[PDB]
Amino acid sequence: ESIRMVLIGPPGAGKGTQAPNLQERFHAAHLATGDMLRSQIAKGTQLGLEAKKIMDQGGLVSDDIMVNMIKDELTNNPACKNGFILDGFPRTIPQAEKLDQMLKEQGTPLEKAIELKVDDELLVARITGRLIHPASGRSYHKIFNPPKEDMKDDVTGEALVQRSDDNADALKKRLAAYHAQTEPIVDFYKKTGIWAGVDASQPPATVWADFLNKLGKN
Ligand SMILES: Nc1ncnc2c1ncn2[C@@H]1O[C@H](COP(=O)(O)OP(=O)(O)OP(=O)(O)OP(=O)(O)OP(=O)(O)OC[C@H]2O[C@@H](n3cnc4c(N)ncnc43)[C@H](O)[C@@H]2O)[C@@H](O)[C@H]1O
Numbered sequence: 001e002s003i004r005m006v007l008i009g010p011p012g013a014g015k016g017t018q019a020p021n022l023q024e025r026f027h028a029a030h031l032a033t034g035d036m037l038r039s040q041i042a043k044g045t046q047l048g049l050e051a052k053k054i055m056d057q058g059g060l061v062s063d064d065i066m067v068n069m070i071k072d073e074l075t076n077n078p079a080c081k082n083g084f085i086l087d088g089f090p091r092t093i094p095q096a097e098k099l100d101q102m103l104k105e106q107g108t109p110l111e112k113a114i115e116l117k118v119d120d121e122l123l124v125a126r127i128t129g130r131l132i133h134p135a136s137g138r139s140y141h142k143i144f145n146p147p148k149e150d151m152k153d154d155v156t157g158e159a160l161v162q163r164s165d166d167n168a169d170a171l172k173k174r175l176a177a178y179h180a181q182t183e184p185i186v187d188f189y190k191k192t193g194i195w196a197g198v199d200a201s202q203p204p205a206t207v208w209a210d211f212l213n214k215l216g217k218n
Contacts, residue, residue: 002083003028009116011174012123013200015087016139021208028083031073033066035137055165058173063094092181096188113189116200120175127171131160
């Protein structure tokens with residue numbers, strides 16, 4: 001029950017929705033670079049204030065920053081000994097190449113790169129209806145996956161918010177960047193044989209079952 005894997009998917013595909021499933025199953029560190037950035041933002045740090053502007057425009061934060069963030073976490077974070085789930089990294093070919101390098105040196109290569117495949121049309125409704133609990137990252141959807149207490153993080157009472165980069169202006173820039181910059185990474189992993197595609201247009205439980213199936217564990 002150990003995994004070192006990457007999650008690749010467009011904005012809205014369902015990475016943050018499935019990761020908890022993977023965490024519980026494999027007890028791996030969930031390293032979501034979007035969550036790390038948002039953490040910077042909330043501490044009011046300088047890196048956070050600069051990342052915030054770019055994120056809100058549907059831009060990508062620079063590779064150097066993102067590689068250093070991940071290198072430190074792989075290195076100093078003890079929870080990353082059991083294995084890890086990279087969520088949102090790598091996001092560009094250079095990050096992919098540098099990650100490859102890093103893991104060679106550490107002698108812990110990636111086992112799986114799961115692509116969550118889902119058409120762009122669907123992704124707009126998903127991003128438009130999303131509410132997150134900002135003090136965790138718990139995502140809900142107004143239509144597709146409602147809080148019972150509306151606008152309230154059901155299990156823990158706290159208030160739900162919209163993400164600032166979930167504006168359909170940012171969203172268009174987010175998708176174009178995914179196709180232009182991130183999608184090429186999929187071929188990289190196809191060529192090393194650790195890629196598996198998952199149908200992320202299905203509902204959550206059906207996607208997770210497909211996941212297990214694809215990991216070759218369940
Ligand atoms: N490495 C890096 N390099 C450079 N810049 C970087 C970077 N990492 C981060 N950044 C930057 O930070 C920004 C944000 O990154 P990040 O936060 O990683 O966002 P993202 O990749 O754009 O992804 P999302 O979080 O929007 O999607 P998701 O697939 O996790 O969705 P969710 O599960 O919530 O689900 C979406 C919604 O749909 C719902 N839903 C989920 N699954 C289903 C289902 N199967 N059916 C129906 N409803 C569903 C949910 O309930 C929810 O409402 C980047 O754009 C860039 O600026």
